Structure formats: structure tokens, C-alpha cells
């Protein structure tokens, strides 16, 4: 499942 970690989501709208 690549949804969670194929991009960094810790602060993707900061």
C-alpha cells in the first residue's frame, strides 16, 4: 500500500 508513504504526509499542507 503506497498511499501512506510514497509521499511524506507529516505536513503536506504547511
Amino acid at each position, epitope marked *: *500500500n*503506497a*498511499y*501512506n*508513504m*510514497s*509521499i*511524506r504526509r*507529516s505536513m*503536506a*499542507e504547511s
Partner: antibody
Amino acid sequence: QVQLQQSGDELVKPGASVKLSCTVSGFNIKDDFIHWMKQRPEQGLEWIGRIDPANGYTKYAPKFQDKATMTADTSSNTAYLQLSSLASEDAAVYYCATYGVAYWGQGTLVTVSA
Amino acid sequence: DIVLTQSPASLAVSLGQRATISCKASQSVDHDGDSYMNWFQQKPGQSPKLLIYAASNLESGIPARFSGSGSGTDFTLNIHPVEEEDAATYYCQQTNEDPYTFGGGTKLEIK
């Protein structure tokens, strides 16, 4: 399954604008960012930016900030990429992607006439 | 921005051998214990296909012949064994810091 269907290839004139689309099926676009990428054979792959269709939030790479405008419509499950004031360096294949960056559209070729 | 450099630019390999492609980032792509490096395969006229995400995770639908290793600035894609269908260009991509960036590609051919 998830499909990203991109709009047809376009021949565009210098100084003109063009708006590309990415119609998503089998996935609610409110559920993830949509990303846009550019590819040229010499300069390779570049990330243009991402849009959050749930709130309209956008983040661009600085080189695309005054060239590209990303929009989206959850009502039609479609994301758009508007390219403005086109010049030769804008000729490229443009891709959309989602599900992180796992699922990609087939690409739209933009060619710029002389 | 993070600059990704692949090595080699082109690789000719014998059917059935192992091959490794290197991707080096100019700054760390690590955050909170994870490494945000992806690997893609692309064949002419087709979109890039995700092979590996977060350095070492095999994408659903991709054969286990592909694996990824590394952390920080240094990453590798390993193909074991190489098969005819593997002829393609391979790209690394970091998604740790905006803007996301891609390596310059490595073109793999069969001898």
C-alpha cells in the same frame, strides 16, 4: 480499480494558454492530493505541484508558480492544469498522479507551434 | 531543493544476472525514521510505473525480482534476475521535501 484519464494531445501557439484535464474514476478525488508532472526527453521528469481537491489547497514548485494553475472539481472528479503564456520550453508530456504517487494517468502531449 | 544523481546513466546487462542502480541525494530524504525515496520504471510511450516506495517497499503488482535499499542520501534499486522485459529507463524520486525531484534516469538494456 483506479483510472486517471487525461485529455487529448494539444498543439498550442506561443503566448496562448491551454487547460489539461485528468478525470479520475474508481477513486474519490477528495481522498488524496492530485500531483502534476512534466516530462521532456532532455530535462527529464519534473514535479509541478500538488492540489488537495477537498479544500483547494495548492503547492507548486517555484519554477511553475507563474506558469501553472492547478484546480479541481470534486463534483466531476476532475483535476485541471492550466498552462499560461506558452513558450517552446512548455512543450512536454504532462502527467497527473494520485494514491500517494502510485497511480498515473497516460499523459497528455503538448506541442508548441512555431 | 534536493538533487538526485543516478549511477550509471546507462547499463547493459546479460539476461539472468543481477543489476544495481544507484541514486544519491544531495541532502537527506529521511524523516521520522522513514526514507522518502521512490523508484519508477518507464518504457517508451508509457507512463512511469511505481516499483518501490519509501526506499524498500515493493509496490503491489510488481515482481519480487525488484528490491530497494538505503537511507539518508544513498539508495539502490536491485534487479535479481534481470529479464528481457526489464529493458526500460529507471528513475528515482524523493518526496521528503518540496519540490519533489527526480533523478536523471538510468537506461537498462539487455545484451
